[PDB]
Amino acid sequence: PGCLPAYDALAGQFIEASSREARQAILKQGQDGLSGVKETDKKWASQYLKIMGKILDQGEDFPASELARISKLIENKMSEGKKEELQRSLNILTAFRKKGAEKEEL
Fold it and tell me: What is one term from the GO cellular component aspect held by the record?
């Protein structure tokens, strides 16, 4: 178990990043990290990385307006017995309702 606050960190750092290239390094962080993301879990990780690509297509609001929701996820602390499988989907749904949004359980 272990939801990925790294999505919120990714998103946050991506803002802080001065150059579009430093922002590309935050995109690379996500992609490099995939090597250590747990078996079965590389799918949650693939989602965040596609939005991180779409920042360069659009702008740095995309994750942050979703991160405003991530607070609410943290605000309602979870039980790692079974809220995990929900909350893990929620991490993506919260910072990124792009693809994982086939779940209207937020």
Answer: cell surface
